[model samples]
Structure formats: C-alpha cells, structure tokens
Target: KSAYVQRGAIITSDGVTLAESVKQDDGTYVRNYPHDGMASHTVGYISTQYGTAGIESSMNETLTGHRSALYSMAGITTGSSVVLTINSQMQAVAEAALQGYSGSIVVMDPSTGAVLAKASSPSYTHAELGTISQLVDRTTQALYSPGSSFKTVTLAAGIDTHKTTLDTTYSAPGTMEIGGGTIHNYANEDMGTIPLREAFARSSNTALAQLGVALGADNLVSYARAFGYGTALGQDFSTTPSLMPNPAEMTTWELAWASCGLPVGEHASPAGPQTTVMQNAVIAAAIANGGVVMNPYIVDRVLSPEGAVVSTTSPKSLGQAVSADTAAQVREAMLGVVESGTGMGARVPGVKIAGKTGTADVENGNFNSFFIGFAPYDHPTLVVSVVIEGNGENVLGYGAQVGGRVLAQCLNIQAL
Candidate 1:
C-alpha cells in the first residue's frame, strides 16, 4: 500500500525482510526514518477535515489493489507480483545529497514514468498535519512559478515550429525589452552574438520570452499544452495541473506576461492530482524519452488480495508529439545547457546529463530553485525534477547547488 510517509520494504543489509525496524535490537535507530523531509508530498498526511493528500489520496486504489484494473495488468499466472524498476540505493544517495535544503526531487524511469524517488521541502516532520494544518501534498498543492524552466517549453515550441535553430545567433547583452519591462540573463551579463544553445545554457529568459511573443501565445500555448501544460496526466499521485495561459483571453501585454510565466499567478487556485504541473513533468519526461508521451500511471500493475491479475498497463503512446529528428535536436540543445550553461551543477563524469534550471520570482521573499534532468542522455534511464525554496529574494537560489548535488548523488556520479 502507499505509505503515509515514505513507504517501501525495509530489507536488512543481509537481505532479511524485517516487518518492523525493531527486533530485539539495540535502541539505536535501524532503518532510518529520514531525519530530513522526503516524499511527504507523495506519501501524504491524514487530516481530520480534508483527509489525506498527495499520492496517498489519489493513488489509494493503485497502491492497495482496490482498483481491479491494476491486477489484470500484472500478468499474474497464479501467484506473482509486478516488481518496479526503482533502485532504493539511488534514492538513499539522492536524499543524503540534498542535505540542508528545502526542495523536492522526483526521479522516475523515463520510459514508463515509474516514480523511483520523490521528495519535497517544508514537509511535515511527522504525519501530524491534522494538528498542524488541513492540507497536504505540498509538491502539487504548492503553487509555483516555473521561471526559465518554462523556457524549455518555449524553446521546444520555437525549435519545433522552425522559428529557431540550435545555431541561431543572438546577442544577450544582459537584458532585453519586453512590454515595457526588462528581461535579463540569470547572471546579468552580456554574451554578444551567442548561439541558441549557448543562450539556452545561460538560462536567458529574455531570449525565450522573445521567442514566445514572436511565436504568439496561441502557438506558444499550443506547444506548451502539447508538452503537457495546463492539464493533468491522470497519474494517481498528488499533483496540481499547470496553470494555462488562454491566448484568447490575454492581451498583448498579458501575452508577454504569459511568455514569462506571469499570468500563472492570477490563477492561484488549489487543485488535485489531475493538475498541469504533473502533466508538464510527464511531457518533459516524454521529451527526454523521444517524443512519445505515456499516460501518467501509479500502478505498474495490480493484484487482488488473493493474488490474481486485475489489470495491466501496456505502453500507450500519445503518438509522436514531435518528430524524432526534432526530439533529437531538442535533446542535443538541453545537453548543451548542462555541458556549458547554468546547469553546470548537474554534470556527472562519464554520464551525459541533459537538463534545464529555473528560478521563479517570489512575491514576499524566497525564490524557487528548480532543476530537471535525465542521466545517460542518449538512452536515458532516469529523469528527475528538483524544486527548492530559496532564502529571501535570492531568486536564483540553490537549485544548481542543492538540486545538482541530489541528482548527482542519485546517479552516483563523480564530479568532473
């Protein structure tokens, strides 16, 4: 069943399955219970009024085999269960690496979107949300503005539509004008006549936002939705949908705002697991996985209490979201971002990590740090998303530092 906190079997070092952590053992903690927060969003918490949230609430049937559809998919020939591809060793490494930070990490099998490890910051220390508050699933429940990361969608649109190219050259002299407001590079520096890949690596908002207005919000929103924004992916997990920008409703100025992920602020409404953010993640995974969008699912397969096949989910492709050629081009561009751009923090020796980072502007203080990437770029096995709440106004917070560290740890990479 889905755990109330972090759930999985606790196997001993010698490979013994222990029912509980204590078995006539010393008072010392065995099988650690995460001193720091992890997976609070997915495991969820129980509240008296609102009940549980996160994967706990949404994946109730999948986790417990209550859903008949899950069992039939497991191919149960009498008594066998569907095992997952999650590597706990990697999860422990990733969690340990993200120390002293407030962030979320979601690592999954890129091909199937099977969550291997998922974590978030500011999570409840214990399952006491009933006393603390009436909400849960902060990973999805928390409304966030995905700054330059949204640029990934923008760039994908720009490239897919033939409006931009990897070799396209532009001047990023620190800033650009957009609807009376000025947009600048992340480091506030000038790189004259930089290539498109270079510009993307530097996390240039002005460049991508410019592309948005040039592409028009209609096309932009279409590509963005194609990338899984403003909708839910039907993952039985606690998640909120991406707040979409309605081109018909937006003015030119509003379109500019939408380009920069602005108008999303207007829709500060609460949502369930069927929201757009999760959908976008799925889309991002699809991008990393060669343009074939797989439906979001929690149960790999399910079995009845008596161990019978109830359901099975084969790979259902959303068809080609983009041509394999375009997908390869986008993949190469993202790799450039990691190899020689702001995503330098995600580098792992001998492993090609392709990714994008975004730092959203916070209203009352504290910027949001975000990093999303996949390892072994050519034939990617894992794709991960990390979001950290940064210290006051440090908009481009420690995403690169903390997120990178966690991701590297998850990959067990040696810094080069």
Candidate 2:
C-alpha cells in the first residue's frame, strides 16, 4: 500500500497544481509538470533516473512521502505539498513583459519581503527539464552591473552622513578630470550649478563623480557595505553574491566612477561586476520599507496530504542600512526621477512611482538596461527589479517600460 502512493503535487498560492504524478502503464507513476516553462524553474522537475531539481529537489523528502513517519507503520504513505508565495498571474505578466529581451524580473512585497513573482527569460519548459543545460535559474544565479541605478547607495550615504542634502548645490560641469582622466556627462552637457537631488534625478554622471570624490572612498565603501553589497543575500534558494571593489584598494578615479556604478579601467562591459534581480529588489525594498531590509522568502507555507499546515514563513529583518529620515529623502529624489528624470518611462497613470534606471555598455558592444523601484511611494507596497541584458540598440527606457507594466499588474492596474 505504501508503494501505491506516488509523489505529491506542487501547487501555487492560488491552488493551481504545478507538479503531479501520472500513472504509468505498469501501475507505476512518474512526476509531471503542467505549466511547463512558465513555472518550471520554481517548481522544478523530478525523475526516476535523474533525481529532482528546484522545489522538487529542495522539498523532496516531504514531496516524496518521506517526511511522515506514522504512515510508514501501516504500509501506507502520503506526502506533503508546498505553497509558494509566487503569484502565477503576476509571474505570467512579468515574464511576458520581457518577451523581446533576455532578462529577469523580481517582484516582492516590501512590507514583508514575500516574493510575489520571480521570472527568468530564455528559460525552458518542463519538457526540457531532463536537459541539464536548461536547469539554470537565471533570476537568482545571474549577476549584472547595476549601472547608475546604484546611485541610490551614494545618495543614501550622502544623506545619512550629512555629507549632502537635496538642496546642497554641486558644480556639475559637463566634463571633469579626476585621477588624470576626463569623465563627462551625457553629451558633455554642463548643468552648471544644480541641487544634489536634481543631479540624481537627471542621472548626471559628472555630478555623481564629484559627489563620490567628496564622499571619499571610505564613505562610499561603508555605505555600499551597509546597503547589502558584497554579501550573499540569504534566500531559501540558491543565489550569487553581489560584488563591490574593496575601498582600501580603490583610487580617487575608481571611487568617483564607482559612486555612480560605472566600471573603472579595463572593465569595459556595460554590466559591471554582477547582481541578480533578487539582490536588486533588496535595494528598492530597503527604501520602500523605510530603510529596513527584510529577508525575502518564496515559500509561504508547507502542507500535509490532509491539507493541514506543516510550516509557515514570517518576516525577519536582514538589517537597517539607514535611518527613516534618510530613506524618506532618497525616496523623494527617486520619485522625481520617475516624474521627470531618466525613469519617466516607468510612470503609471495615478500611482506614485519612485524609481531609477541604468544603462551599461558590455565588452561585446551591446548594452544592458536596468530598472529598480517601488509603487505607491507614500505607503509603498511592492518593489520590482528588472534587468534587460544584451538589448542591442534598444530604446534607453525599455527596462523602465517593462518594470512599470509589471508593477501595474501587481497593483491591479486594469489598463496594463
């Protein structure tokens, strides 16, 4: 009787079964996935010879009926199921938004850090699960240069350390020579004297470089460290660590360019070091949650075959990187970016969006697009991070457009 029971089914938050067992001709059963490529990486696959992957691998014991000891005595067995926090509808929308590009999207609840949607493009369906090459989950495993989107770190450092204020003026020249080299703004257009916040909203490379020099390498490095850079973000699933150059080894020019997330000498790739969508979401979530970074979770709860709850996940603070006041200041500046700056393309009809955009040139002569932000700025609820890689000659705001649509879908915007 115990052998008669097959593996458990993997379900989503809204009760859609993703993985289940199909009876074979010989009275045996094989695990099968229904949604295929859409939720493939999250639900994973189980095989008789190849073992398991994703949740099927991560929660195999419970799913394979190994978690229950009492049932073993009766020669009968039943396994438990896992309920993921990911929204199938939102996941579809997020994935669809990246149709023409290769990228990843992460949508999360800033209040609790519950992952609502995590999708990586160029992914394969369950049919291809047996192929080892298609198994990589690009969302958590991939890294990217965050481009100017990382300016948020510099802004937070400036505000938190009293080094600069929104009203603080900076001499934003069109071009500046630092460390015996020239760094210029977009098209070398001089903004003359402008408020610090204006430069941030406009994404002025020159102003950020000068600001970096003013903040000094130590301040920039410390702020980046405080903001969760160079650390492996602890997630129940696998993830790659985001990187940052050691400040002690950075020169004046390196510090200045790094402030705005630009690569130094020989770092020709548009996407600098690397970061996953989940890591980028943390940057926005921290600001949305008023400077607190909460641990991100995907699995909401586990359940037994009888439908009883086995376990649940609760919100926990990862750390506080800045004070509430400092976060508020940065939030305001980001809002300006969406309203009239580089992130203007991410604007929703009535939602107050606070966001930033980034563009980087890779060694292959292609560019990458990045966007990070949250919605309903006053009382933020959702944070979204999107990165479009190898988007050759695409519009500058493509990333923002995709990010905005994803946020709108999450917010239940009917038009989107």
Candidate 3:
C-alpha cells in the first residue's frame, strides 16, 4: 500500500547479502532474499499478514531505525542493516550436508565461539516461513539427548576431580548389572579391562556408567552446569537450556544412565539429560578452547541506516568449565575416537581430529545419532556438533561421516 520502505539488508560474514528490501517503480517495497531459499530461518521474512520472524523479527528496531510511525506510513525511512558471523559458503556446505536427514548441524569456531553455520534439516524458504514445522531454529529450539556425547562432560569431571585418569582401567562387561538395573554396550559388546581413553574411544556405555557411579551425581551435575547445562546458551535469539537432572536423590542405576548421557524416565520425575546441538557444539568447543566456554554469538555487528557501525560483539567467556589440564586430557582421549575408535568415520587425512560418537534412544525402537568434535588437534579451529534423528545406524559413523565432510571442506583437506 506504499506505506513502507525497504528495511536494512542482512549481510553474511563472507560479504554476501542474504536479505534486502527494494522499492519498485510502482512505489511498492519488495523484500527480496538474494540468496533465495538459503538461510530462510536466520535471515527470515516479513509478511504484513504474518508479522516478523528470525533476525527480521529479533532486530526489528535496529532494522527499522528511529523512524516515527508517521514516517513509516509515509515510506520515507530506511532501516539499518545487520552483519552476521555466518559464513555463507560454509553455511551452504552445512545445509547441503543435511539434505536427506532430519537433524541439525552446528559449526563453530572453538577459539572464539563464533557460530559459522547452523543448518537444520526439513528446512523451508521464504514461501514456507509461516509453515508450523519450519518455524523454529532446530539448532537451539529443539532438544536432543546427547547420548554418549555427554560422556565428554563426565570425562572432564572425572579428570578434574582426581576421580580418574586417562590410564584408569575399567573392566566393562557387555552386560553390566548394578543396583538391580543392567546396562549394556552397543550390541552388548564388552571391552574387558581397558584404560579410560580406550573406553571413551569405544564409547563404552557400561564403562562410562560405571565411572559415573564413582564420580557421583553431585560431581557430575557440577560439571554439567560448568558446561552450560540447565541454562540458556548465549546467542542472538532465545534458546532452550540444556537439561541435566539434579540426581542427588537418584539411585545408582538411574544416575548411571543419566550420567552416561541418556535421558532418564518417560515424562516422569527427573526428566532431564537433554541437550541441543548448539549446546553440544559448545561442549566440544569448550574442550577445544581449553576448558573455557565462550559465549556463542551469531550477529557480528549492527549497522545504522547510513552504514555506520552501531555495535560490534566481542567474544565473552562463560567461565572455565574445567581446567586446562583436564580439558587437554579429555582432548587427547577424543583423538583416540577419531584415530581408531567409534568416531573413525570422521577421520580426515593429515588432519588430527578429536571426536565422540553418541546414540540416543528416541523411543518406539528408534534412535538419534550424534557426533561432536574439533579438527587439527594442535590448535583447533573448527568444532562441529551433529544430531541426526531416526538414523538408527552406526552411532559414530553417520554423524561422524556427515560432520567430517564439513570439517574437511572447511579445513581444505582430503576426506578419506
């Protein structure tokens, strides 16, 4: 109705314009997404009928500027722009990787907590923005059981509290019975008595469950909070907090399952041990960043209508979740996962990778696959967390394989 002007443009980190508004010869403003369907969830859209969404909705004030309602109605005010930390090329690769799957892939820079790409499958374009299914960003909004990936947190707790060391040996049976409950390894496979490192690489549920009993719920929950559980993660948008049940009153058997990274119970008491891909990414990134979890952020800065920088986001720390020594110890063990363990599928030629593979039961005989890791172990640059729903396939293989390609592409290395 010629009552609105073009809002600010949303630019990518690599200098690609994602969304913009253009005034046509007919004096009508057309909001065009230059990248087409790409990042429809992040760049979002504007429908007079549906209101605002994504960054379009989150930063509406910045984009709309200080124009009065009268100016807005007169169509004379241009909104400010926003620069995001998302790398368009990497975002493409990340999203492309999720094409046939139902899940989310979060790529972050462990060194700075900068989110490189957040790709959620079953995605939609501007046309489908209002669709109920694609409405939420899965990376943060959706909760996924961390599965064995949560072991990394428990591993950190064990090492930090002097409860165990990498060399600590465990005789994990294929079928472990304790406190009237039995825990089994994947396919009920046993690893005899192996070191903590080997157990981790094998993703030994029995072994880690045993370790959880020793580490105790008090200590385990502490490390979970230290890893940003039970709290909303730092981001440009509202996030679902990763859950870790307070198991002080829990029995050994239940605590074992919860501590092993699986959600306990069914809509009952202590309904927790849940996490999001975004939180899982930080768990890996914290280990990569030497125990200090950085505040994860996507928006790099905001620009004024005239292209003046109004604000630039600086990386902030979420405090040290563990000590450098403990983080390094867990890191070396994770390298074992990629080197010759469960996460072997994620290995890239000539690049030292550290990772963990996890499987979560999604009820009704289905499961979810998860892979969390970082590349170039010496001084890690990229951290990736992938959660694929209903894969019921190899725990370490699919998500590992999926995340590996992203790591390889971003690292410019050969993926073998």
Candidate 4:
C-alpha cells in the first residue's frame, strides 16, 4: 500500500500524484495533469522568498495554528476543523463544467464573502510545488490581460462617477480608434451603433474602450483601485497585484496601449497589478446587496474548543459603493450581458442569473477570460469569478463557453 500520512494540519490525497510538470523538448514547461483544466488555479504552489498562494496559503493558519495573527483572539478560538462555505457538490459540478479546458473558477456567498468553490485549470499540483518549482501562484502570480471582462470595471466606474448608464448610447461600428490606436469588436465584426446594453451583450471591445476613454484614465484607475487592484489584500498567501499603469507617466502611444490592457512595459501581477479580487468581489456582491459594499474575509467565526463563540465575522459596511438606484441600473446592464449578451454561456435555467464576461489579451500568447456573476438574481446566493488562460484555444474566444457550464451545475450543489 502507498504510504499515507496526516502530519499536523496537512493531509495527502491517497499518495498518488495527479500531475507532473515536465519541460518539453521545445523548452516550455507543460503540466501534464489529469485535471489540467479544472481548478488549476486553486491547487496553487509555493514560491521561495516570495511565499505561497491559493487555498494552501489562504488556509495556512487554520491548518497549522502556528501563527499569532492567524491565531484566535483572547476569547476566540477554533476547533479541530475549519469548515468553509464551499460545498463539495458545487466543487464537483464546477470541475465537470471545465472538463476539457484549463482555467479557474471562484464562487462566493455574496452576503458574507465566503468563497464557495475556487477551481482553476492547468493548476500546479500541491506536492509538485512543494517539492521543487519556480512557478508561484499563477492565478495570483500572473496578471492576465482582461479583455471585455474589464468592462465590468468600466461600467462600474461609469455609474459610480455618473459618466454613463444602462441606457447610455454610443455609435460603434466594427472598430474604433482611441488615442490614435484602432480597437476592433470581437471577431472584427460590426454590430452598428449600439446602446450600452447591446454593446455589453455582444461583448463589444470597441464600445467598452470608448466608455473607458470617456471615463478618463484617472477615473478608470480610481475604479480599479476601489475594486481592489493596484494594491495589496494583506493575506498569508502571496498574490499578484492587479495593475493599472499610470497614464501620466506614459507617452501618448504607451498610454493608448495601457488603456487597452497592455502596459507600456510591465508584467501584471493580479495582486500588485491593477486588478483587485476584493474590489471585483465587492462590485459583484454590492450589486446583490442593492449597492452596499462589504469587505471580503474567509473566516466566519472562531469558536472555543468548548463551543463558545470566541468571535464572529459580521458583515461590515464600506458605505454604499453606488446609489441603490445606480446599482439597479448597473444590474440591468450586467443582466443583459448574461441573458442576451456574451454571457449567454452562463445562463442557469430556472434561475435568474446576472453576469459579465471578460477576455483579456496578453503579449505572450496568453489571454484571460472572466465570468463575474451572482446566482438566483431575484435573491442572490452567490457571486463567482472564472478566469481561463488563453481562452483554452482562440486567444479571442471566451471561457464562458466552458466556465459557465461549470457554474450552472455548481449552483445545484448544497452550500457548506
């Protein structure tokens, strides 16, 4: 029998490896794993000096209880187990949805910010990263160039700054020019002049860019920061920052590309780069809460071994991120993205779903796809984020075709 060990707070998964990273003859390291496309981002790895990430990093204290900050307060303590909000059935459902693709899935309880299921494709196996590797947390390490999905931020910024609305109108053909650079719609196809609703539904890059520019680079960055990028989340795990290059420091040509997702000269880290999961999570949940913003935290409460309530993590308000009216307006636009637009893949039959799809372009043949949403639209139970590398095929395509399949099924699972 294979050796099995349960050391301290860590356990093994039957002592068999699921994946192995091998440097191909051509020089690129390809992780030949069975579940390459399912939860690849969640099985994050360790990075020397820089620390680690993913569930490993996020749940480090709960597993070990060796650190003080991760320790409970004087009155608050924890039992032997640290149960999370994620439902096992939901995880399996999400895994099935991304059967052939490599990417990520993040689902959370909109009300409390509890992560339900976080799955990513092409993920580094836990043992592999712990043994020997240079790759850090790819999900949080590498900054993906968000394509149309960046529009969510654009839309939020527009509404927050009172720049645009669901009914806002813009003339868009197949292509547009911003700062002397031409931007094209998906598939280089023209859909004629469209309302913001139509532009979002069709996932029109040109339309979103027009909106982004109209919102101004500074304001765009401001929204990016407000959503949680371009800074830190202060967690045990290391994360790449979401990047928003400063336009003031850019040459006119550079600024133009910066607006389009490619910084003049930079490697985007989701943690330090210009994007914020916290910000995005807030944007997603706030919509469910009628525009009220709440900070994201993993733990629900700490209990003493005797079962007394040591401390509770209640929902704290961060003021209104948007007017209830404005949030309602934004929800309508997002709904269009899901019901009739690019997020058609994310439809949860018998359930009203609200979501947005994003595709980002990276210089190195890599693309990031995002599906941000909340389920049971009338009374939301969760918010989710799906990021896939390279669209799993066409750099211009979306993971929605794959990610959404997983979300719909995961929604059927019972929450933990």
| Best TM-score among the predictions, by candidate number | 3
Q: 1-416, model 3: which lDDT tens digit per residue?
A: 23366678999987899888888786767777876777777777677765666788777887766635364365766778999989888899898898877888989999789888888878877855446445567888888788899999989998999989999899878988966889999899977999989999898889999888898878888889888888788667556898866665667787788777887654334556889999999999999998999879889999887888989989988899999999999999999999989898898888898899888887676788899999889999899999888755434368889888888887762221
| lDDT to native, each model | 0.59, 0.79, 0.83, 0.57
Give candidate 3 misplaced runs (Cα > 4 Å).
1-5, 24-28, 46-52, 67-76, 130-132, 266-270, 391-396, 413-416
- Weakest lDDT window of 10 consecutive positions for candidate 3: 65-74
* Highest lDDT scorer: 3
Model 4, 258-344: lDDT tens digits are 444444433332221244343455567777778776555544444344445445556556556567776777777878878887788
Residue 58 Cα positional deviation in candidate 2, in Å, after optimal superposition: 3.0
**What lDDT would candidate 4 get against the real structure?**
0.57
Quickly count the clashes in candidate 4.
Answer: 38
| Whole-structure CA lDDT of model 2 | 0.79
Which residue pairs of candidate 2 clash?
37-125, 143-275, 144-274, 144-275, 145-272, 270-360, 270-361, 270-362
| lDDT of model 3, residue 298 | 84
RMSD of 2: 3.6
- Ranking of models by lDDT: 3, 2, 1, 4
Candidate with more favorable, higher lDDT: 1 or 4: 1
How many clashes (backbone N, Cα, C below 3 Å) per candidate? 18, 8, 0, 38
Off by over 4 Å in 2: 1-5, 23-27, 46-53, 67-75, 130-135, 265-273, 413-416
lDDT string for model 2 (1-416, tens) is 44456777778787888888876675556767787776777777666755566778777787778644554343356678888888888888888887766888899999888888888877777776466534556677777777788888888888898888999998888999987788788789899999988999998988988878888877877777666766666455556767766666677787777877776734332223356777889889999999998778778888887889998988878789899999999999999999988998999998898898988776768888899999988898889999887746664778898888899888993233
**Alpha-carbon error at 248 in model 4, in Å?**
2.9
